[PDB]
Design a protein around this ligand. Structure first.
Ligand SMILES: O=C(O)CCC(=O)C(=O)O
Ligand SMILES: O=C(O)CCC(=O)C(=O)O
Ligand SMILES: [Zn+2]
Ligand SMILES: [Zn+2]
Lengths: 341, 341
């Protein structure tokens, strides 16, 4: 019942288990499995409607990308610039560069380096070459500049299905598709997005651990003006229970996606994403959508994500009102101590 | 230098000290004296301009009320209804009755009872009669219904001086004059107002201890939706240093006003007001003014009162946004724990 990702799935044509338990990292918290359903299954329609996660096994959302691999992409993706993140550890914490202004005591552990696709493949094979410890992760919005055959591939994605989805949910506009290419063992640590996300797995296997928005108290996001806004301050590998005591109460929904799977990551749901160990490279394309307009007007009791949105807006205005994001905390403290605690 | 109210002043015509140290209650914190200046003294103009307190000794602000006493008032104040607050202790904590809706676990220790002036005088003499322990405090906005001679008295107040004051400071409109009649030993505990206040002493002697707005952290106001909004949660007689540790750092400005004195209580300044022990009844009329409009637009660094105004508005909106004032604290806590503390 704290199964996790369940027994590993058996590949078609007796090809043996897709992955195994020892490819998964181990954590301090328990998990229940996210359900894997067919896109035609009413229950999957329920889950998305109710903004609960679900793994859709047969959407064909990115059917033409399933052939993609580094050789094909290097060949066909064009000469555009690609954002590539570097790291010394397996954890790729991300930094909003616009926000680094107002936090000096903040040095990166993951630098963005712009480079052509072939320089990526090259760097990858230079590192592989000599068993170097360092790691990379390419993450780049698909756009205009992309080669003829990638565009045909892109156009062949299942727009009919995902557009119906956008329509049934009242979502706003598709904002971006991010292309993610990772090395085995890479972790994008726990964070949340404000958009809705269909996360479409193309190559390799990723374990995705999700936490609902009502676990805000257990996951301790950075301050909103901090560059790691929306990310957990907790190190999943070495959790500091003195600073983050509610982490001991955290409960995840967990799954492993492979080629053809689409994971619905609902708005404000925390997610932690790791490419399996010794699984090779992973490739994923996501689909971010705005999110249905806010209701006219509120109906109580508020949803967890609505309380989160409120906390964000309080922090923001207080940043503005005080003239300085650094004064947000002392003010809030002064507001609560001996008054509301 | 922590003098306090200074050596007591000597009455004209060798009538001996107006009051003495043993009429003053004793507290845990130190105080410096508020300056007593002449209204013609440029330094007093400085203090009011800079929103610092000052005791003006010669305004004649309420010259015609100096003859007032219970017999005169009973005689001349008319048959209107007068708000009279009751108490079993010397501390008259006030309750906003509009706010009692959203706090059930809140019972009074000071009930408002409407009564004619003669019923007040009567009750007072019924209690005096038999050495009863209970205490009363009349506090009633002067208005329309008031007798012919009180109106002539009122009209004889020094409008020329106080209106010039209103003009020089850019204050808005006079909102009310409250008439306060107290028994010896009555304490109105520490609180702040959002209006500017010229506090005009008429009969008897009051000790006024003021704290500037930047002592918010030491004085622990109730939540804004609580009925004791703007009042300190700290009991000055028995301070709980476990709950209110910054009370140990509190520093007051202190003075004793008698007949003819006017104390400028600047906006957002905390004040604690006690009628001297065994001093007899006290009488005071205050003059509340709105407060200059807010500046277009903000200039940094913000003043303490501006940060207070912000904390108030955060608490208010969060009350509205959450649908329920009771959920304000859990939200704020969730916002700060492990995040900003
Ligand atoms: O695949 C990853 O590591 C990041 C995915 C993610 O965070 C997202 O799609 O929102
Ligand atoms: O005289 C009192 O006890 C109350 C005075 C006061 O709080 C005020 O005038 O604002
Ligand atoms: Zn994400
Ligand atoms: Zn007051």
């Amino acid at each position: 019942v704290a199964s996790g990702s369940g027994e590993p799935r058996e590949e078609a044509g007796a090809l043996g288990p897709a992955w195994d338990e020892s490819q998964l990292r181990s954590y301090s918290f328990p998990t229940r499995p996210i359900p894997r359903l067919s896109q035609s299954d009413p229950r999957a329609e329920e889950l998305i409607e109710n903004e609960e996660p679900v793994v859709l096994t047969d959407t064909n959302l990115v059917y033409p990308a399933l052939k993609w691999d580094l050789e094909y992409l290097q060949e066909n993706i064009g000469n555009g610039d690609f954002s590539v993140y570097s790291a010394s550890t397996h954890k790729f914490l991300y930094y909003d560069e616009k926000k680094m202004a107002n936090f000096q005591n903040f040095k990166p552990r993951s630098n963005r380096e712009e480079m052509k696709f072939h320089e990526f493949v090259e760097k990858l094979q230079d590192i592989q070459q000599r068993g170097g410890e360092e790691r990379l992760y390419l993450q780049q919005t698909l756009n205009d500049t992309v080669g003829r055959k990638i565009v045909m591939d892109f156009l062949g994605f299942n727009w009919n299905w995902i557009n119906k989805q956008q329509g049934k949910r009242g979502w706003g506009q598709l904002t971006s598709n991010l292309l993610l290419i990772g090395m085995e063992g890479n972790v994008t640590p726990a964070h949340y997005e404000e958009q809705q996300n269909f996360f479409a797995q193309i190559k390799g296997y990723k374990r995705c651990i999700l936490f609902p928005p009502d676990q805000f108290e257990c996951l301790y996001p950075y301050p909103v003006h901090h560059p790691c806004d929306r990310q957990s301050q907790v190190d999943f590998d070495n959790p500091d229970y003195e600073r983050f005591p509610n982490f001991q109460n955290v409960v995840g929904y967990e799954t492993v996606v492979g080629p053809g799977d689409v994971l619905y990551i609902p708005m404000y749901w925390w997610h932690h994403i790791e490419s399996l160990l010794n699984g090779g490279i992973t490739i994923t394309v996501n689909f971010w959508y705005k999110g249905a307009p806010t209701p006219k007007r509120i109906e109580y009791p508020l949803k967890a994500h609505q309380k989160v949105a409120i906390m964000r807006n309080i922090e923001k205005m207080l940043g503005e009102a005080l003239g300085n994001p650094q004064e947000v905390g002392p003010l809030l403290n002064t507001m609560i101590k001996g008054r509301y605690n």
